[PDB]
């Protein structure tokens, strides 16, 4: 207060209507995959399995050869889309909006959608496949995706461009190159990625650093992102290499919706939010994990 | 429903009326005194009407 003038009541400030936050982790998982819209509770896609064969005839006949004479058979696994239901709910109280300033409901909706967004992405990164989707680390293991060795982990780590050269070789037949592929990195590993001989200085210029989507990094045209959702200790994970449009679509028959119930116990509003979403894949696999998988 | 075939709403409405129609006719044919009106066969059973 004081201040030494004729009248009291110096400055009390003001309650500013704005929602501040820190710089928490970013939602990279739910942002780089395409969407498959569906109209019912199963869907099938007729997959052509790579084939053909041109017999060519080196003699002047007439009646030889029948190219093609019979043709390839359907790869009916099937490739079903099993659509898990995730949902959330809240409560809101008629009685306390008048007491305050009527600003609680817009910030209530944002924290509910951000919490739902974190819940879906952490599940898409890491999951079993029980009552919820199975994430990529669990999935990249029905195939031999785990690579060896990492040279050194825990005590005196060092990461170099030789690591990505192992991964782009171990993939190679189950995943292409050029356009596009994506790499997801731990925040921890990005703290070690300073210098590694050739090329100098991480990824510069790399063409043209950054332009096309990816929150920093451009090693040879490959885009990089950080998900901050990997543990540390001798057997863990660091890099995850993921396909872009070429498999790994997310299916759904509905967008985000927000319902409002009331009473709900005497007088009281509530909000119910429902989604239905999962991740599925085409062809064989297309991912590599490890890396960071020995001792 | 959302993931089905869209024609479900008339189907539910026919079932509710058909089940109601059987239920009222069943009560009219064969109801005793126990929490239901008295039906025709039971009414002739009591009043010796046979």
Q: Is B1 on the interface with A (CB under 8 A)?
A: no
Give the three-class secondary structure for A119: helix
Please choose, from the candidates A291, A175, A169, the residue with its C-alpha nearest in 3D space to the C-alpha of residue A230. A291
Shortest Cα–Cα distance, A53 to chain B (Å): 41
Question: Residue A274 has which token pair?
Answer: 């429902």
Chain A residue numbers with beta carbons less than 8 Å from the beta carbon of B2 are 253-254
- Radius of gyration of chain B from Cα atoms? 18
Q: Which residue of B has its CA nearest to A82?
A: B3
Q: How far, CA to CA in Å, does B3 sit from each of A40, A84, A151, A272?
A: 4, 12, 50, 19
Question: Cα separation of A9 and A219, whole Å?
Answer: 61
Question: Residue A181 has which token pair?
Answer: 């592929």
Question: Cα separation of A147 and A247, whole Å?
Answer: 22
Kind of pairing between the strands at A250-252 and A35-37: parallel
Q: What resolution in angstroms does the PDB record give?
A: 3.8
- Displacement of CA B19 from its chain's centroid (Å): 6
Residue whose tokens read 């929150």: A215
Q: How far, CA to CA in Å, does A179 sit from each of A94, A167, A246, A274, B13?
A: 53, 17, 9, 35, 53
Please choose, from the candidates A290, A171, A225, A165, the residue with its C-alpha nearest in 3D space to the C-alpha of residue A33. A225
Question: Cα separation of A260 and A273, whole Å?
Answer: 9
Shortest Cα–Cα distance, B10 to chain A (Å): 19
Sheet strand arrangement including A269-274 = A87-92, A269-274, A257-262
Residue A279 near residue A243 (C-beta atoms within 8 A): no
Please choose, from the candidates A146, A135, A138, A182, the residue with its C-alpha nearest in 3D space to the C-alpha of residue A280. A135
Closest partner residue to B5 (CB to CB) among A40, A83, A253 is: A40
Cβ pair B4:A83 closer than 8 A: no
Question: Residue A225 has which token pair?
Answer: 């992102």
């Amino acid at each position: 207060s004081s201040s030494v003038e004729v009248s009291s009541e110096s400055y009390e400030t003001i309650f500013s209507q704005r929602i501040i936050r820190d710089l928490q982790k970013e939602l990279v998982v739910g942002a780089l995959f395409e969407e498959l819209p569906m109209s019912s509770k199963i869907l099938t896609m007729l997959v052509e399995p790579d084939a053909g064969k041109a017999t060519w005839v080196a003699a002047s006949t007439y009646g030889t050869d029948t190219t093609t004479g019979e043709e390839v058979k359907g790869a009916l696994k099937e490739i079903h889309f099993s659509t898990y239901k995730l949902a959330a709910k809240s409560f809101i109280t008629d009685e306390t909006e008048e007491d305050a300033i009527f600003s609680l409901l817009p910030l209530l909706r944002k924290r509910l959608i951000e919490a739902h967004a974190v819940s879906i992405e952490e599940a898409f990164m890491t999951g079993d496949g029980s009552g919820k989707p199975k994430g990529l680390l669990t999935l990249a293991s029905e195939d031999s995706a785990k690579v060896v060795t990492e040279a050194k982990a825990d005590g005196s780590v060092l990461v170099t461009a030789k690591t990505i050269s192992k991964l782009r070789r171990k993939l190679g037949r189950h995943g292409l190159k050029l356009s596009k592929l994506v790499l997801i990195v731990s925040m921890d590993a990005y703290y070690d990625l300073l210098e590694d001989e050739e090329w100098q200085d991480v990824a510069q210029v790399g063409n043209d650093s950054v332009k096309l989507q990816g929150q920093v990094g451009r090693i040879y045209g490959l885009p990089v992102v950080v998900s901050e959702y990997f543990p540390a200790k001798a057997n863990s994970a660091e890099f995850a290499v993921i396909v872009y449009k070429d498999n790994f679509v997310m299916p759904r028959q509905r967008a985000v919706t927000v319902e409002r119930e009331r009473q709900a116990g005497k007088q009281r509003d509530a909000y119910y939010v429902t989604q239905r979403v999962n991740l599925q894949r085409y062809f064989a696999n297309g991912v590599v994990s490890g890396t960071y998988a020995a001792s």
